[PDB]
């Protein structure tokens, strides 16, 4: 068809200029002339798009198409003397339909300056090696015979090198192997052997609580997850009980020396578990199942305090609403547990350390619950209704959070 601009827009323009009482044939005469000039320019701006080898366009093809037709490029002002603004364009007007029509010079100064990129360079790579396209990141994607393994010997040697580097004898070797896991596109069809190596490892690595072996395996899990190419939820049924035990298990090695790393190991395990509950989600299978196991870990009476601390951390990192509903009716039990560890003279065991870590974590989570959906007031002795665990020091932490909010 031949679509033109509407004539009922051309009469609005005419009567808002001082030219009243225009006929319909006078008004139809305006809207076939200007609709041709839009069609003449958009067909002529198409030349610059096809010779600019882009199709997408950069605000500027109409500026050269106008200059080609001996019409000045700038829109919104027309100079009848032509000399300060010749056929050089001013880049158009950054205007919107949903704009405010109100602007402040001070507000523009207040806005932070954006970042300017490094200048264009020239990198070379390989599309084809003697006919075959490589999988580099610059590329898009009755005696019978004996069978062969579905991995190549380069792939099997790669698996052996990556697994012997990921057990962390040297740190630079680990870090590359972790980046190699994080971005190898062909790491599918090797993924059963990686999942089995992880799963089997943690289970025979908690027989003796070897923390590095576990911290390296959790980093291997995290490096497996952020790889975008591979399909993981076929293997998550092996991945999730491995991270579960890491968080909810007792430490066979001495607790005091590597408790900070044990908390970090639980922290790595909770972070992967929360990412696991964020991805791979269908109705009522994964997130609710680990939530139920965490709550019956909490509810069970007279727990190991390592298991208690790990389950507390796992319950806490589940997001905004989960602590808004699951960390409310239980403060009295937490306080009673802290009071029992406090009473009595035996501190040799790990119970006291577990109690201090659990109380600190629970108190910080309470702070956003107090900040997110409550108003601060009576920060001196009202917390004694919650067994008086953090009290005024908790109030001081809330005040520091308020100061950080003011700085923001």
């Amino acid at each position: 068809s031949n679509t033109v601009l509407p004539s009922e827009s051309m009469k609005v323009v005419a009567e808002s200029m001082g030219i009243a009482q225009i006929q319909e044939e006078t008004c139809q005469l305006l809207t076939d002339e200007v609709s041709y000039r839009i069609k003449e320019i958009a067909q002529d701006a198409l030349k610059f798009m096809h010779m600019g080898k882009r199709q997408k366009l950069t605000t500027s093809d109409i500026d050269y198409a106008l200059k080609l037709k001996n019409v000045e490029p700038l829109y919104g002002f027309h100079a009848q003397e032509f000399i300060p603004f010749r056929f050089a364009s001013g880049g158009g007007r950054e205007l919107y339909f949903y704009e405010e029509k109100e602007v402040d010079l001070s507000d523009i100064i207040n806005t932070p300056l954006p970042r300017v990129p490094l200048d264009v360079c020239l990198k070379a790579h390989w599309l084809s090696i003697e006919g075959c396209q490589p999988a580099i990141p610059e590329n898009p994607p009755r005696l019978k015979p004996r069978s062969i393994h579905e991995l190549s010997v380069e792939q099997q040697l790669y698996y052996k090198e990556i697994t012997e580097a990921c057990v962390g004898s040297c740190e630079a070797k680990r870090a590359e192997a972790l980046q190699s896991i994080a971005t190898d596109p062909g790491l599918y069809q090797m993924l059963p052997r990686f999942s089995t190596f992880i799963s089997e490892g943690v289970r025979v690595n908690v027989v003796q609580n070897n923390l590095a072996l576990l911290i390296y395996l959790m980093r291997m899990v995290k490096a497996l997850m952020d790889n975008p190419t591979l399909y993981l939820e076929k293997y998550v049924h092996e991945l999730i009980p491995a991270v579960m035990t890491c968080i909810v298990s007792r430490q066979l090695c001495l607790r005091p020396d590597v408790d900070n790393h044990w908390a970090l190991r639980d922290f790595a395990a909770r972070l992967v578990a929360q990412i696991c509950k964020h991805f791979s989600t269908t109705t009522n299978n994964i997130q609710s199942r680990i939530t139920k196991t965490f709550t019956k870990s909490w509810v069970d009476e007279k727990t190991p305090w390592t298991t208690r601390y790990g389950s507390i951390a796992g319950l806490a990192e589940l997001g905004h609403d989960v602590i808004k509903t699951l960390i409310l009716p239980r403060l009295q039990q937490e306080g009673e547990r802290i009071r029992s560890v406090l009473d009595g003279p035996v501190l040799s065991n790990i119970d006291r350390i577990g109690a201090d870590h659990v109380q600190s974590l629970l108190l910080k989570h309470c702070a956003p619950v107090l900040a997110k959906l409550r108003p601060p007031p009576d920060n001196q002795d009202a917390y004694r209704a919650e067994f008086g665990s953090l009290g005024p020091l908790l109030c001081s932490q809330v005040v520091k959070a308020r100061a950080q909010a003011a700085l923001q």
Binding site: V206, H237, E238, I240, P241, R250, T282, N285, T293
Partner: peptide, 25 residues
Amino acid sequence: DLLADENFLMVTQLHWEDDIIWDGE
């Protein structure tokens, strides 16, 4: 709808806690 592919992915059909030995004999 219970024949949807996800129902059969072993993340939605496997108990991680149960699989681990957890020092139990």
